Design a binder for this molecule. Sequence first.
Ligand SMILES: [Mg+2]
Lengths: 108, 223, 136, 42, 100
Amino acid sequence: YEDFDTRILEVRNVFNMTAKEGRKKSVRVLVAVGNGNGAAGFAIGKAADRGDAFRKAKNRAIHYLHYIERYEGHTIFHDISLRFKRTQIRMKKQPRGYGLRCHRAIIT
Amino acid sequence: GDDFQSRILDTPLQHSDFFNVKELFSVKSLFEARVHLGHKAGCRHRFMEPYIFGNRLGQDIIDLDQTALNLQLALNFTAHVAYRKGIILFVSRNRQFSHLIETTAQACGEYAHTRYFKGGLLTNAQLLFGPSVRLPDLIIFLHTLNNVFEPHVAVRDAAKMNIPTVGIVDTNCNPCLITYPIPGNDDSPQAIQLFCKLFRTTINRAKEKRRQMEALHRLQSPK
Amino acid sequence: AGSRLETVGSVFSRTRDLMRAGVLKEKPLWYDIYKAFPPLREPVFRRPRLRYGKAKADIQDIFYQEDQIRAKFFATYGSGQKAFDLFNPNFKSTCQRFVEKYTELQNLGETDEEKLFVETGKALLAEGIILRRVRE
Amino acid sequence: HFLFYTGKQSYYSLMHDVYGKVMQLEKHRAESRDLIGSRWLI
Amino acid sequence: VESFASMLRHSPLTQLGPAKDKLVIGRIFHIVEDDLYIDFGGKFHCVCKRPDVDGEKYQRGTRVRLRLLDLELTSRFLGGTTDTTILEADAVLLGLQEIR
Ligand SMILES: [Mg+2]
């Protein structure tokens, strides 16, 4: 998968209280992958070591590849407004040279 | 050489009924086997109402005209897959028909899994079976519900792996994820026996046609 | 690398997308078959929902015109003492013979239901069928 | 083997044979102690 | 060729009308100890108990007489969204059918 790139979107140090260890820490990583040609996916990997959470999330996301339709290879086909849970996103189709003017995660 | 291989694999797709599966069954044949009998109205699934002819005093009746159309498509698809030497797996958790379905698969030359389905069998196959295990190319669900009246795990797991599924779907079943749903009775022994014969005759015809198709094209190469 | 997303699209559309992306280099063997002989409906996921308010299903109660006659026969004589044989595809029950004769008289032009019910009983009595008018 | 995808092809192949034998005996129709001082294999 | 609509109208099951307290002929196909599994031509079989009288007569293939009650035993329960079904029919075994 040399044509695919992986980017990190969040690294969290959550805690699970245990009788043996008290507060126990794991690394929860959210990553996204894409080949820059319409195919992309995301996954979450959890482990006790950060390096392991990177491997788990990176190889899991390659199994959930969406294909996204791009108008003329540079933009969305039409405006998109949606609510996912309590997060609202309002995307707009723009002409060439407009660039990405979006949340930093959306730019990634 | 290359032309012959193209002829074997590309010619069957230029005919609407290359294997003549239409003759195997008829609306009358299905009605004799009680394939139009569904569960009571209380057990009805919302996505099965398109296929229901009506409610005869509480018992949903399955339109055997839609069943004939859908069965033709499902049998036609199952034949081309068998023609191309794909792996076909019969799946059911109904224990009354466990031995019949395992015997059917053996007669066809294919595979059956009528036992407890292990979580990850298809999504985690390489762990459970080995490094280079080849997964099924088609799964035929004679029963799509498990013994706790829930969808068989392999319906979702076959979609996750992008495997087409031919399933018998009674009035209480969920056909949305079945690629080729066949609306019909799944409980009666005479209905299940009919479907098993149809899938067995169809697969053997498709396998036999491939043998004949290869001999004719192969013979032409020297001749 | 694949698309284990069974709630978006269908197995065929997801396989079409993976090949367009460049991840799936060889067509599956079932692909060309699906392209030529697709199912009637696209196999896409849909979440079942309950009906609310005044939404109702669209299932016709199957009631033929013979049932009006059959209901009377069961109320007046019950089920025929001869047992139903549902394995014989051409079985003729005592009630079905009553409804066949009741129809014949109605074709002649009798308009009174009472006339057709008592005359039919007489005709079957001549045939020798044992009809017991069991109020119990 | 046609029972490969069960994961216990040999256990289920044997349970297939004994269940088919049982069916033929039940359909077709003395002391059963033909062997004594024996145990089932562990 | 007869249509499905005609086949349904002239079907023995359509003639039966309501299946409560009707008399039907069944065939024993499976026996488990003193439990008889009887096919009476419907979707689901019934399961009755071997009568004390003439118990040996009730063997596989033996045709019997029954009094139907339900073709499928189902019931929705408090808080349920669908009817629970036991995939069985209800009938009372009356005795062997006279071969005559
Ligand atoms: Mg069913």
